[PDB]
Structure formats: structure tokens, C-alpha cells
């Protein structure tokens, strides 16, 4: 499998005086640490969330971050006066890299504007999109005159994160591969015509996120099947729904069958 | 934390130089710096990397792909960049600050002499006494001149010097001493000097 | 400017010690002391993360500097030290990725014993016969001999104006007598011109050489003459043999 | 206004009376991110409600997680109510039990 870290950053700006920013980070599909306008440190979820850092540096990491977040918004500020732009401003970032084994580890760092990509980091210096408006350019060439900030930034995404997620693919080796098994039932929902009824089949619990649902006439697999979303519980497992739209005869002796990396061979099978 | 060279390298004017350094317990967050210093100054920062490789106007920076060793790389080498390299490791975090220095590769530029011609001539004193240097030159750089068992002779260290308008080099060194016996026809081990030496006349009017 | 090491030479005596400057242009908070020995490395006396604030380093027995602010890091000598004779080179350090700097550097001989000064002797000696036969090129010798401590500057002149194609100058100094902790220093030089140019009268040459020594407020008892700062020169003359 | 809120509801257990469970509420894809959440129960808005940290996928686009404990009966009913900038009234959706 793979387990990338992703850290995402939610800055919002309503008017001159009121702003937030909130943030959180991901490795694979479970959340790691959670950051919050509130506090004032990077919180950590689980007992592994520090890697193999030193207590020393994982503080002086939180003093970098610290003064990242009172500089941004003080920069972010400062634009919207020079370039003239209105208040209502939504900022997202997503940074992060993915270790590779055989030497090809990914670096990226990709600015939002309205939820619009506008810039991102590339080698040793910012770049803007093609799609991205004039204005961004007038931006652009006054952070890459920042070299500090440029050659910092370097240094977290070449340096300190692939040695972050070799830290922490370490120390939560065991809940990372945990497995948890479903469980499964029918019910009936929404009918789509007078004689067409319609079969729910719903599975819930199950940690590694990929799963594999269908109905089947007992073991004829049929393509009147159609999944919903994984969604979460709170418990960091998942849900998910599936339909089967057919009339009332056609509906006596199916199957809702599921397959899951935790059940060992064996498959959950609900008939009706 | 620390670093490996070799003491010593030699390299001829006007090539490309390697000079290697180890480190096989490097860290992801650990900047590498390389730093020279000629013999009466202080030392200047040349070049630095983290994680790629890098390319300045002098020199360029090749790290291993295994991170363990790395190679600073002098395109054209001249006669000034003789002078001793230090290879460094600096934390990025910015942790302990005993920034301390190894002992560095000690880089020696020889001349390409086009015609050698080594004789040791006899220079007398400027209308003042009868004082006598002895002055061996012109030989190729291979030549490495080691100094007398006795202690009254005083004997320098190979020294090019450089014409230009002629576009001419040359090596020499140079021997004196009061003593009695003291003559340039052994002032110099036999050991150290090419069997086609000129001993000129020791007449000299 | 960068970092200001003064003087470059600076000598005094046993017991009559000192405290020596490093001085800093731009803004930085880190500055170091370093000490080098002929054909040594650098080795670490003190270092300072900012003002206030010191960290002793491996060979800070027998030193004590300070950091009043963060423009100035003095470093006083007095404490017994085993050679106080060497060079020192003061260094400051920015942020990530944490470069390097250096001043130019003060050298301090300090006599082991009394005022053994001794100013050098400069002599010139005249091209070989042979080697203008043999060559058609000319080679002048310059000889300094017998000075202590070893701060000294050779120049070459030629009618009037300093010249530096054809020269070239002893990386180091050479003793005399290497049993002797103080002994007396010499050094040599070359100047070669064509054969044409050295057979012409008219041409004038001059080795200088510039000594640093004791100060004219040090008292002196001794019928030689106080051996000052002074420049000792030799020269010679062309000719057609 | 850009983007406008997705909404479904559903319970971590098989609904079954008299027995402990927990009533889930997902919102997503919508933009920008203020957006407030309610869960209720019977009409009434319930005050034990918790929720995951606010998060966004690769197309920019938000999402969110409510959720609580309840014991569903035969006689309680319950549902999810959103109102967003994009939305003219607030949107409530009930959770199908049958
Ligand atoms: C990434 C690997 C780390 C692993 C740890 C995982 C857990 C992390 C915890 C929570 C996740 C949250 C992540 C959020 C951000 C991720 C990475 C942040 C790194 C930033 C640090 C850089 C240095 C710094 O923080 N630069 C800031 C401070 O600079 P300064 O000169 O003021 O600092 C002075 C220090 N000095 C010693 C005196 C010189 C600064 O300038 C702001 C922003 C610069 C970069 C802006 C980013 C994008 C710009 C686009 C906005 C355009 C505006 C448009 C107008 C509408
Ligand atoms: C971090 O890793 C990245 C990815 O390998 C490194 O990016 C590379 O950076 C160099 C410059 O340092 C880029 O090439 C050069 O750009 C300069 C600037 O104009 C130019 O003078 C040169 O002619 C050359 O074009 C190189 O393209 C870039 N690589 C990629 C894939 O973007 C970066 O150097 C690393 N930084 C550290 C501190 O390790
Ligand atoms: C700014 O926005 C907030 C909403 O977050 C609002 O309550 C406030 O009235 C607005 N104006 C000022 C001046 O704060
Ligand atoms: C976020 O924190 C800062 C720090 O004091 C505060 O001024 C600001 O009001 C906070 N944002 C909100 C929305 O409360
Ligand atoms: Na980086």
C-alpha cells in the first residue's frame, strides 16, 4: 500500500480584522495530528504521531509553524491592499511528500485562491498556473525575494518530511496494518416504482478502506448494483451503501455479497 | 556527525579536480558545505547542498545517491586554487553550535612546464662581500626537492614564478650557507636531481 | 568590511598580554574564535548564540571572551596559555542553512624570553653568467636573513614601481635554528627578466623588505639601534657583463 | 457562493429499538467552508453533538463529520439540518430508518 503525508491548511479571511486558521494532517487514510486557530501548539492524536524526532527538535518544529501562521496572515493581509482585491479571501495549502523505497520521493506544495489552484513550489522557487489571473505574478516575484523563507521551505520538503514519515511508518507499524471485519444487513428504502422494490444492503466497521460489494442471483453477478460513497464513523472505520432497483418478482432468492482484505477467505453473504 | 577526507592531492593546471569526502552516518536533515582556505588568509565558504546536486560558477556539488559520500568538483583548476578544503556538516534544525572543523584535503597545483631544462647555477653578491647562493630551476614538476642532512645549509621550497608576457613558468629553489665546503655541486642531494642536470663551470670568471 | 581583525601583526611579550578585537558590519548573532597553528587546522576556543550568552569550546582552557553586544566579541590571552603564539581568525554564522564568515585574521608572536628582536639583513644576488648563456633569461635572488619574529613583506621594484610578473616569494618563512623556540627567521625571492632587459644599465632593481617589531615607547638599553618597524632594502644594477 | 453542500445520514449499527448507537451526518463538496450543522431529534436540536476537524479533498472541496449517540424507539424520529451561504432556506434530511 501506500501511506503519503498530506497537510492541509484552511485560512479564511472574512473582513479587515476577523480571520481563522485551522489545519490537520493525514498519513494513508488516518489523521495524525490536528492543529487548531485556538491553540497555540500542533496537537498529536496518537501516541506514535512524533516519529523518531527528539523532543528538542519536535519543539523547535512547533516554534517554525508558530511564526508561520502569524507571518502568513500578516503577508496575506498586506496583499489584498497592494493588489486591491475584496475581503471575502479563502487561502488552502497542500504540502506533503511520499517516501519511495526505491528513490523517487515526491515533493509538492500547491496554494488555493476561491478554490482555484493559483501557485505552487517547484524547484527552489514559486511558480504560478497557467489558469491563474495577472494579478498572481506581482505576488510571485516578491515572495521568491524572500531567499530565507524559499530556502527553509526547501529544507521541509527535500529533508525534515521523508525523514518524518520514515519516523512514524516505524513507530505506528501495528495500527497501521490493524484489520477490523465488517458486518453487514438488509433493509428496504426508497421504492422506485409501484411493483419495483428497492434492496439496501449496508456494511459497516471495516479499517483498511478499500472493499469490494455486489449483488449477485446467488452467484451470477449482476450490474443492477450500484455503490454509494465510503463514508466514516467516528471509530476511523466505514460505511457504505448498495442498491439493487428490481420489480417484485425478480427480487426472491438474490445475495448481497462483500469482500474485505480482513475477512480471510471467507465472504459475508445476506440473502433475502 | 562528522566527516573524512584524504590529507593530501595533487592535481596539474588548468583541469578538473575531484576531491571526495565521506560521511556514512548523514542524516536527512544535514546540509553539507565545502570551504577553502589559502595558506596566510582565512578560510571562504564555496559551495553547499542538502539533497541535489548543484552547480555554482567555480565548482559544483555531486552527492551520492546513498548519501554517504559526496564530491566537490573544481572545473578549471589554476595555480591560485592551491589551498586546503574542508568538507563540513551543518544540522538543519540548528541544534548543537560547536561548529567545528576537520583537518581538511591539502590540494597541491603543479605547472605544466613545456621544455624542462634543470641546471643549478651559481648567483655571487652585489658588490658587497663574497656570500654565494645556490639556485637549482627550470626542472620538470615531477621534482620534488627535500632538504641537506646538515643543519648550517638552509635550503627553501619549489617556487613557480610566471612570466606572462612570454606566457613562460618555471620551478625553483634556492640554497646558501657560510660554511667552507659549502659548493653548489653538492649542495644538493644526488637523490633529488635528474641525471641530465647542467653543472655549469664552476669557474665564473 | 565584513568582519575587521587590527592590526594584522601584533607582538608585546611574555606577562605584558593583551585582548584582541573582531568587529562585525552586518547583523548576526553567532560569532566564533578560532586558532590555527602552521600546518593545522582550525580548532575552537569559544563560541556565542547571542549576546549574553557563551558556550566553551575544546581549547577554551587559558582564554575569556564576552559578548557585551552583539558587534563586538573581544578575546583576551592573559590566562596562562601553553602557545600563546599563533593565528587567530574570528567567524560569525546566519540563519539556515548557516554559512560561515571570517575576518581577515591577527597573527601574535609573543617572545618566549626578553627582547630577542633582530631586524632582517636584506641582500641581492646578481644573475648567473650560465644560466643568461644557457637561457637568455636572467634570474635575480633576495635574501632576508636573521630577523625575529617573522612579520615581515617582500616587494620587488624596478625603476621606481612595484612589479609582481616573474616573482615569486617563500610561502613560509624558514628557521634558522629549529631547536630554539624564538630563533631568528629568514626568507627568500626570485625576480627573473629576459637576458636583453638585464644587460642594459639603465635598469635599477630593489628588494624591499618591511619589518614589524617592538614600539618606540618600549624602553631599550643596548648600543645596537632599537630594532623599530623599519624597511630593510638591498639593490643592484644592470650591466652587459 | 460556489459551491453547495452534499448531505446523507446514517447510523454506525443496524437501527435496532431500545439498543445504543450512534446517528452520523456527512457534508461535502461544498465551498466555501463556513457552513453550520444540526442534529435533530424530533424537530428539536440535540446538544451533545460532536464533530471531526474540518478537512477538504484533492478538488478543493470541503467536507465535515457530525455525529452522536442516540437509542433509537419507535417513537423518536431524526435528522440533519444544514443551511449554507449557497442555500435560500436551511436543508433538512431525515434518517430513513425503513
Ligand atoms: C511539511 C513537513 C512537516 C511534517 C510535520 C507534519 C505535521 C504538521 C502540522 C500541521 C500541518 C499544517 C501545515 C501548514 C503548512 C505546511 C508547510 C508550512 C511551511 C512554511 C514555513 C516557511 C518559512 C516561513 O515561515 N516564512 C514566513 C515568515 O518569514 P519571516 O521573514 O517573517 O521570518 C523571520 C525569521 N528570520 C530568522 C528573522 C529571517 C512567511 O514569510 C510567510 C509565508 C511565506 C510562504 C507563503 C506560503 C504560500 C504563499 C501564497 C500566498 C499568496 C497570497 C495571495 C493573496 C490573496
Ligand atoms: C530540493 O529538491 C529539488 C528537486 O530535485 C531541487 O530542485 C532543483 O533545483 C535546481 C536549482 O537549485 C534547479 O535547476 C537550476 O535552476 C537554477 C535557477 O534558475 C538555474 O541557474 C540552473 O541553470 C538550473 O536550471 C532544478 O531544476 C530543480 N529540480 C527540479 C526537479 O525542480 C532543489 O535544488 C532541492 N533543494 C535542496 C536544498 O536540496
Ligand atoms: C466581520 O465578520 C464577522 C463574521 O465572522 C461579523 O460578525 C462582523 O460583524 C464583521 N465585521 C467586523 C467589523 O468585524
Ligand atoms: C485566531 O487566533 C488569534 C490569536 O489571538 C485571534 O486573534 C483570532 O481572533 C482567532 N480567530 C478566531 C476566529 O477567533
Ligand atoms: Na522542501
Known amino acids: 500500500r501506500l501511506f503519503p503525508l498530506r497537510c492541509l491548511q484552511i485560512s479564511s479571511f472574512a473582513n479587515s480584522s476577523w480571520t481563522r486558521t485551522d489545519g490537520l494532517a493525514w498519513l494513508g487514510e488516518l489523521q495524525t495530528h490536528s492543529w487548531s486557530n485556538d491553540s497555540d501548539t500542533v496537537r498529536s492524536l496518537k501516541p506514535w504521531s512524533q516519529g523518531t524526532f527528539s ?54 506544495f500547491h496554494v488555493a485562491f476561491q478554490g482555484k489552484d493559483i501557485l505552487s513550489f517547484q524547484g527552489t522557487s514559486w511558480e504560478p498556473t497557467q489558469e491563474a489571473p495577472l494579478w498572481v505574478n506581482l505576488a510571485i516575484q516578491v515572495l521568491n525575494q524572500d531567499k530565507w523563507t524559499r530556502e527553509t521551505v526547501q529544507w521541509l520538503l527535500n529533508g525534515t518530511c521523508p ?22 444487513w438488509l433493509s428496504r428504502g426508497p421504492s422506485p416504482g409501484p411493483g419495483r422494490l428497492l434492496l439496501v444492503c449496508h456494511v459497516s466497521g471495516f479499517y483498511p478502506k478499500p472493499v469490494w460489494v455486489k449483488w449477485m442471483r446467488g452467484e451470477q453477478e449482476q450490474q443492477g448494483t450500484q455503490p454509494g460513497d465510503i463514508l466514516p464513523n467516528a471509530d476511523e472505520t466505514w460505511y457504505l451503501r448498495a442498491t439493487l432497483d428490481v420489480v417484485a418478482g425478480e427480487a426472491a432468492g438474490l445475495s448481497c455479497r462483500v469482500k474485505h482484505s480482513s475477512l480471510e477467505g471467507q465472504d459475508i453473504v445476506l440473502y433475502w | ?58 565548482a559544483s556539488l555531486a552527492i551520492a545517491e546513498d548519501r554517504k559520500s559526496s564530491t566537490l568538483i573544481l572545473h578549471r583548476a589554476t595555480l591560485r586554487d592551491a589551498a586546503v578544503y574542508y568538507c563540513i556538516l551543518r544540522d538543519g534544525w540548528g541544534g548543537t553550535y560547536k561548529y567545528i572543523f576537520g583537518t581538511g584535503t591539502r590540494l597541491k597545483v603543479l605547472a605544466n612546464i613545456q621544455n624542462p631544462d634543470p641546471a643549478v647555477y651559481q648567483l655571487r653578491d652585489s658588490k658587497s662581500s663574497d656570500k654565494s647562493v645556490c639556485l ?15 643543519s648550517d645549509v638552509y635550503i627553501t621550497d619549489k617556487c613557480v614564478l610566471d612570466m606572462r608576457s612570454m606566457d613562460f613558468k618555471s620551478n625553483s629553489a634556492v640554497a646558501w650557507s657560510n660554511k667552507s665546503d659549502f659548493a653548489c655541486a ?20 | 568590511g565584513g568582519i575587521t581583525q587590527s592590526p594584522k601583526y601584533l607582538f608585546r611579550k611574555e606577562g605584558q598580554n593583551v585582548t584582541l578585537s573582531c568587529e562585525q558590519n552586518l547583523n548576526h548573532d553567532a560569532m566564533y574564535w578560532y586558532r590555527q597553528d602552521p600546518g593545522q587546522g582550525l580548532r575552537l576556543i569559544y563560541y556565542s548564540q547571542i549576546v549574553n550568552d557563551f558556550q566553551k569550546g575544546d581549547i577554551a582552557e587559558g582564554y575569556s571572551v564576552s559578548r557585551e553586544k552583539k558587534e563586538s566579541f573581544p578575546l583576551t590571552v592573559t590566562s596562562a596559555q601553553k602557545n600563546p603564539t599563533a593565528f587567530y581568525l574570528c567567524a560569525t554564522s546566519v540563519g539556515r542553512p548557516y554559512e560561515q564568515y571570517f575576518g581577515p585574521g591577527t597573527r601574535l608572536t609573543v617572545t618566549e624570553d626578553l627582547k630577542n628582536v ?48 616573474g616573482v615569486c616569494t617563500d610561502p613560509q618563512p624558514l628557521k634558522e635554528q629549529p631547536a630554539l623556540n624564538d630563533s631568528r627567521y629568514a626568507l627568500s625571492s626570485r625576480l627573473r627578466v629576459s637576458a636583453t632587459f638585464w644587460q642594459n644599465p639603465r635598469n635599477h632593481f630593489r628588494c624591499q623588505v618591511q619589518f614589524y617589531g617592538l614600539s618606540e615607547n618600549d624602553e631599550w638599553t643596548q648600543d645596537r639601534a632599537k630594532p623599530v618597524t623599519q624597511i630593510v632594502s638591498a639593490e643592484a644594477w644592470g650591466r652587459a657583463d | 457562493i460556489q459551491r453547495t453542500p452534499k448531505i446523507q445520514v446514517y447510523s454506525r449499527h443496524p437501527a435496532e429499538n431500545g439498543k445504543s448507537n450512534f446517528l452520523n451526518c456527512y457534508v461535502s463538496g461544498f465551498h466555501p467552508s463556513d457552513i453550520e450543522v444540526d442534529l435533530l431529534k424530533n424537530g428539536e436540536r440535540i446538544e451533545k453533538v460532536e464533530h471531526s476537524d474540518l478537512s477538504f479533498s484533492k478538488d478543493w472541496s470541503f467536507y465535515l463529520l457530525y455525529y452522536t449517540e442516540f437509542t433509537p424507539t419507535e417513537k423518536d424520529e431524526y435528522a440533519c439540518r444544514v443551511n449554507h451561504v449557497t442555500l435560500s432556506q436551511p436543508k433538512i434530511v431525515k434518517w430513513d430508518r425503513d
Open chain 3, 118 to 165: 633582530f631586524p632582517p639583513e636584506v641582500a641581492v644576488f646578481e644573475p648567473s653568467e650560465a644560466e643568461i648563456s644557457h637561457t637568455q633569461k636572467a634570474t635575480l635572488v633576495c635574501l632576508a636573513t636573521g630577523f625575529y619574529p617573522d612579520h615581515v613583506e617582500l616587494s620587488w621594484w624596478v625603476n621606481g614601481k612595484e612589479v609582481h610578473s
Open chain 2, 1 to 58: 556527525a562528522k566527516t573524512t577526507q584524504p590529507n593530501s592531492m595533487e592535481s596539474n593546471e588548468e583541469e578538473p579536480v575531484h576531491l571526495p569526502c565521506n560521511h556514512s552516518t548523514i542524516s536527512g536533515t544535514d546540509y553539507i558545505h565545502w570551504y577553502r582556505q589559502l595558506p596566510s588568509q582565512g578560510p571562504e565558504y564555496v559551495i553547499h547542498g542538502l539533497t541535489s546536486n548543484v552547480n555554482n560558477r567555480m
Open chain 1, 55 to 108: 523532543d528538542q527538535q519536535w519543539e523547535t518544529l512547533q516554534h517554525i509553524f508558530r511564526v508561520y501562521r502569524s507571518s502568513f496572515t500578516r503577508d496575506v493581509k498586506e496583499f489584498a491592499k497592494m493588489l486591491r482585491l475584496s475581503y471575502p479571501l479563502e487561502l488552502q495549502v497542500s504540502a506533503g511528500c511520499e517516501v519511495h523505497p526505491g528513490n523517487a520521493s515526491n515533493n509538492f
Open chain 2, 136 to 150: 637549482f630551476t627550470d626542472f620538470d614538476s615531477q621534482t620534488n626537492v627535500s632538504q641537506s642532512k646538515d
Open chain 1, 163 to 184: 525523514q518524518f514519515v520514515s519516523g512514524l511508518l516505524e513507530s505506528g507499524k501495528s495500527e497501521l496494518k490493524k484489520q477490523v471485519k465488517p458486518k453487514a
Open chain 2, 186 to 205: 653538492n649542495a644538493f642531494n644526488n637523490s633529488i636531481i635528474p641525471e641530465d642536470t647542467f653543472f655549469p663551470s664552476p669557474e665564473s670568471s
